[PDB]
Amino acid sequence: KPQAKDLTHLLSNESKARQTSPLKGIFKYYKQPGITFLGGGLPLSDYFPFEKVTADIPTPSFSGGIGAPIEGENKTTIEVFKKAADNVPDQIELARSLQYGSTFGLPEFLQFIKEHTDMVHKVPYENWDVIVSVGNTEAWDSTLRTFCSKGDTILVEEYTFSSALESANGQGVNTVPVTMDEFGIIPEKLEELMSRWVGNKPKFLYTICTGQNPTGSSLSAERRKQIYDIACKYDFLIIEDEPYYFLQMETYTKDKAAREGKAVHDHDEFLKALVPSFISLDVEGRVVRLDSFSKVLAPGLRLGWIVGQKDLLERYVRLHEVSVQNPSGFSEALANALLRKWGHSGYLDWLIGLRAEYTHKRDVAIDALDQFVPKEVSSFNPPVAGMFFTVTLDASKHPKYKEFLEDPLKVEAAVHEQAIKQGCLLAPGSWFKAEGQSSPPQKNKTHIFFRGTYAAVPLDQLVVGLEKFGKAVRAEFGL
Amino acid sequence: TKPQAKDLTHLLSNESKARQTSPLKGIFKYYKQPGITFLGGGLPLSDYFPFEKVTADIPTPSFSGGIGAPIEGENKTTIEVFKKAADNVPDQIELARSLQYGSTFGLPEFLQFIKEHTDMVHKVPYENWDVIVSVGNTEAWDSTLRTFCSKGDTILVEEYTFSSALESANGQGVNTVPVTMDEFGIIPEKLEELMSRWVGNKPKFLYTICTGQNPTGSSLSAERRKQIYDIACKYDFLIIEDEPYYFLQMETYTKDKAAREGKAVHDHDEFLKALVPSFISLDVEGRVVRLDSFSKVLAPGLRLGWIVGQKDLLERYVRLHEVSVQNPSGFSEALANALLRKWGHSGYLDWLIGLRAEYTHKRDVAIDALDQFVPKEVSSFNPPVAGMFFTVTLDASKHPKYKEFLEDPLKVEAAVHEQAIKQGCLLAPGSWFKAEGQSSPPQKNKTHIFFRGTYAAVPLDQLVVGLEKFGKAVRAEFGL
Ligand SMILES: [Cl-]
């Protein structure tokens, strides 16, 4: 494959200045006979008070559903002993996985994650790599520290993850909002914004492009292509923060009958149905992907990875060395053991069960919106991916709109309070509104929304909450 | 009833002060409130977490076979953490909770044990102290710089110190002004004089690895800690005690091998009395932050430590943690909680006493070998009372090529390093650890070298082989 473009000009001055420890240049002499190596700081693994760790995990192909009790034939016991000799093959024995080591990641874990990445995403340049993270939260903080200096500008979705904005605000990085419709970023308006751009270009575009938080939108293949062309034309990176990528679902249909027939029935059909990632389009190497186990296995793993071109990933590693250092050896050893026990085939089985479970929740959620929410003042886009749904309301139709000084946010607050009074809580959309100006600034409404999740609660309680939300909209809008 | 700490919020960076809670925190109160269907969150379903159980085999108090004895037979205890609270022994963090998103402060069972531990050892002398989790001292140091420093601010560091700690400061544009040391650590009299003359904005804090100092192997005496605390109070800066080696304190070195066993701590009371007072034990004002870690006590791969300090300063670390590291591994915290609660405070003290015995013996063999093999004509050594590092100091001015080297001690250091490599032994040159920096604006404005070794990394037979090789290297270069 071709080499990626040289994008080291997009690194921050601070990232570029980062150095390896001066004790790197005695590492060669480590574990090399003839030399008694006394120049290091490693504690003795002999004292690590963990002889083995075990977990009980479910068994592919998860035929009883991924939520089935982990018992009987749906229970296998994985074991990571301290010594390599005591392990089945391809494990990270605790004497090494609980020892300081390469900030890039443990070799068995990285090998598995690299194969997964290439199998799904077919990275179309030669010099790509994967490094470990302790989750997309830390990966995001590190991304800002690698590509942004104080006063720099990034592009964000005009509604996005509040935590992502808070990280940007703490590093003094301007978050200029990119206009969305119910299907996400509008490529025409991003092209227009960049065609007129005054002063230093934004360093990158930050996108939760699958199951977007909070809109529940997913960028179509067609919008991803157009946004990619903009990033190549104006020379900025795309950061795809993709913890919800494997919460893609069957397309929603009003027709209940035509649902059981829709499910994917094998691995090659599953992999073909997945929306192309930005990394799959990234012939230039200007995409950095933040991947996580948090929504796939468990948030408490504190384990993810970063996909991108070797020379940009090398700067993240320098930062990792003097910040988070490395993920938990327990997390990385146990994830390695689970993924190798399942193998790629069982991990694919797991992702297919995840797809089936979320497809059903979304079906129940959207059936309930269609049923209970009054259509005269509302709309909804059924999500194709993610844990989130939204309800859009025409605030201008609230009977107190004039008394509220034509302020849509007073209508949002009144519907919020009414929802709580009816015994249901959604997240007001305005809470996710991104604000920012470039330095210097670029030359220079009535619809509100609420974010819900169908991932959290039992589906009987999801229907109870949404009927109550329907009542709250009816009471407030006088229908 | 202890005093309140001083209000030190004026020492926070403007950036830290401006950090906010998630707009979503003010709907958490409705979470799991009866009558509310809570659809406002983003927690995935614990029903799918593919871990029914995690277990570990750990050694058994009082570790009478030594902390490194095989974990088998009576020296094997199986701890289990089930997914469901009902399946666990008491005080466990069931995987349904430990593997779910949670308070960035920490899991309450782990915090409770580590707070008890902290008070039992350090007796924090103000009321409004707390502890929060970290993913180790590396991250807690990165966080400390982001909490108390803006670009162009100044911190005080030990003249020779941890290269990773300086790399972290350099990355944040924080100036590292070196504080003069002798073989016993920071010289308080010189630090007081530096501060008495100080022009421009005061340093935000002093960064010290005060016990088993990297790389000097020094430990500040109780007396130096007192004098240094007084300077921090008088000039109003914080003390960041980065203390991963606190529990590698050892018996005082004596040449008399016969005297060693009788002098050793055996009991919990003797142990708690032999430990050097922490800065937090002195910290009547609440101007100390302690970075604590299990990396040198349990295993580096836990990626679990904690931060000790006054409530209002730790809350700012928590805001930063929420949008950086988030939380330590729930496997790490759940297994650490299980191990610590199974051993209890009594078993944990037993472990720390075994650790003290193990390190004391490694240090005895290392220093006995230095005494035996390193030529005394051009060398000296300070036996450490704590840590994993020893040093050998050399008078570069006595090297026969000193004139040929233009009286550059660093050329004598390079020559000894190369000769050591050629004799088959490798130590870390002292100059590699030297800190440099100037305040903004700058303050108005040596023949000895040293090497750092560790006695913790290799079997003790190989350590003696290595230090005899280093003696040969010093004898060859100095012509002795
Ligand atoms: Cl796979």
Ligand SMILES: [Cl-]
């Ligand atoms: Cl809005």
Ligand SMILES: [Cl-]
């Ligand atoms: Cl000392």
Ligand SMILES: [Cl-]
């Ligand atoms: Cl020096």
